[PDB]
Amino acid sequence: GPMRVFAIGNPILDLVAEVPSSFLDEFFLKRGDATLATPEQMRIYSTLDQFNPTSLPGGSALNSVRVVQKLLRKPGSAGYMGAIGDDPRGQVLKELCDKEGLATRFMVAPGQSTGTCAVLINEKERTLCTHLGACGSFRIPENWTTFASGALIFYATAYTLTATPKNALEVAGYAHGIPNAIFTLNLSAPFCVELYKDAMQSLLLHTNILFGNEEEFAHLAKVHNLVAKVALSVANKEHAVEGATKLVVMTRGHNPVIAAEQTADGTVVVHEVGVPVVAAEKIVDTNGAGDAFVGGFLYGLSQGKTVKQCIMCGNACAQDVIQHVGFSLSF
Numbered sequence: 001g002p003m004r005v006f007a008i009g010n011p012i013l014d015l016v017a018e019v020p021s022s023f024l025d026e027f028f029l030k031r032g033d034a035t036l037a038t039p040e041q042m043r044i045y046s047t048l049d050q051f052n053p054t055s056l057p058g059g060s061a062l063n064s065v066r067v068v069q070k071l072l073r074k075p076g077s078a079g080y081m082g083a084i085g086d087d088p089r090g091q092v093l094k095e096l097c098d099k100e101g102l103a104t105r106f107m108v109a110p111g112q113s114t115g116t117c118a119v120l121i122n123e124k125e126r127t128l129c130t131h132l133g134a135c136g137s138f139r140i141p142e143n144w145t146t147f148a149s150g151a152l153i154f155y156a157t158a159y160t161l162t163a164t165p166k167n168a169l170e171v172a173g174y175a176h177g178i179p180n181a182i183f184t185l186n187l188s189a190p191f192c193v194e195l196y197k198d199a200m201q202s203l204l205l206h207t208n209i210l211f212g213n214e215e216e217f218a219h220l221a222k223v224h225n226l227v228a229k230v231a232l233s234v235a236n237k238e239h240a241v242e243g244a245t246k247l248v249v250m251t252r253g254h255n256p257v258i259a260a261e262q263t264a265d266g267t268v269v270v271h272e273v274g275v276p277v278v279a280a281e282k283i284v285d286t287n288g289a290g291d292a293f294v295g296g297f298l299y300g301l302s303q304g305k306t307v308k309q310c311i312m313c314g315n316a317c318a319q320d321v322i323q324h325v326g327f328s329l330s331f
């Protein structure tokens with residue numbers, strides 16, 4: 001069918017810049033972390049101009065769906081909903097989605113600005129500091145099911161919980177009642193795991209595929225029981241548990257990707273797939289690596305490939321993205 005994957009997310013503009021460690025210190029940021037800007041960090045946005053930053057579209061789920069749309073090519077192959085502000089920045093994101101052929105229904109929040117994320121590159125790592133702005137007012141429209149009619153893969157990032165957990169809950173609810181449809185979720189960042197524990201619990205029950213990195217699962221283990229790689233991964237599959245797709249995919253930088261699935265009979269299958277080596281000197285920045293991996297994974301899943309094949313496609317998409325500035329598109 002036309003629409004193959006439908007997602008909700010926070011559309012944001014990324015401002016990328018290479019900054020010295022001193023900048024991280026002055027802004028109270030932890031290298032490699034992802035957080036929402038506190039009042040004191042608001043000054044980071046204007047101050048970046050001294051570093052000649054570059055700007056490009058961002059937003060975790062948007063980045064992912066853009067990979068699926070690029071690989072599927074047909075207009076409306078991927079659908080997306082989110083909220084943008086009534087400003088020139090919002091217009092740039094919108095124009096870009098239209099030119100890429102994605103199907104979108106953006107909600108415009110008058111009086112508010114389009115979200116922005118400062119992507120600070122230092123050493124090799126990326127640190128993210130975001131100001132949601134209009135993204136926080138996002139509410140799914142009553143007829144979203146009509147816009148996404150035909151889609152069998154629904155995706156949401158935990159980052160959408162900040163606006164309200166109702167959005168993702170409604171999407172999962174809908175998918176659940178549809179046979180042959182699956183709901184997929186990304187843990188997004190440690191902060192989401194720690195702040196939205198309750199909503200996540202209800203959400204996990206209705207999740208078919210859970211994606212996240214080692215750091216996110218670690219917090220998920222602690223916040224929940226299991227505690228403890230492989231064990232953490234097998235651990236998380238209970239949260240989704242208690243043939244219906246139940247799979248957990250854990251990414252971890254250059255280390256092998258670990259996927260654990262629970263088959264119909266209760267058999268647990270775990271795959272440990274290596275990630276092709278990429279010389280460090282060839283890496284530009286790792287911003288968007290996980291989003292690219294999820295996008296390649298969902299596109300392959302859309303084509304009926306196997307779990308291992310899914311993972312290989314995700315790895316290939318991520319390897320391309322890490323060789324570019326911010327979230328690029330190529331292949």
Ligand SMILES: Nc1ncnc2c1ncn2[C@@H]1O[C@H](COP(=O)(O)OP(=O)(O)CP(=O)(O)O)[C@@H](O)[C@H]1O
Pocket residue numbers: 126212213251252253254257275276277278286287288289290291292293314315316318319322
């Ligand atoms: N050093 C590296 N060498 C090769 N591949 C790497 C890599 N770092 C990341 N990847 C690729 O990226 C995938 C995801 O890595 P990871 O989840 O750790 O990214 P992330 O958490 O940086 C990205 P974002 O900026 O979206 O938040 C891995 O499964 C792998 O395919």
Ligand SMILES: Nc1ncnc2c1ncn2[C@@H]1O[C@H](CO)[C@@H](O)[C@H]1O
Pocket residue numbers: 010012013014034057058059060061063117128130159160287288289290291327
């Ligand atoms: N709170 C957030 N919600 C959604 N996307 C985000 C958030 N913070 C950072 N991102 C995005 O994560 C991407 C890297 O995975 C960047 O392109 C950035 O725009």
Ligand SMILES: [Cl-]
Pocket residue numbers: 008009010011059060061062157159160
């Ligand atoms: Cl998002």
Ligand SMILES: [Mg+2]
Pocket residue numbers: 253286289
């Ligand atoms: Mg990384």
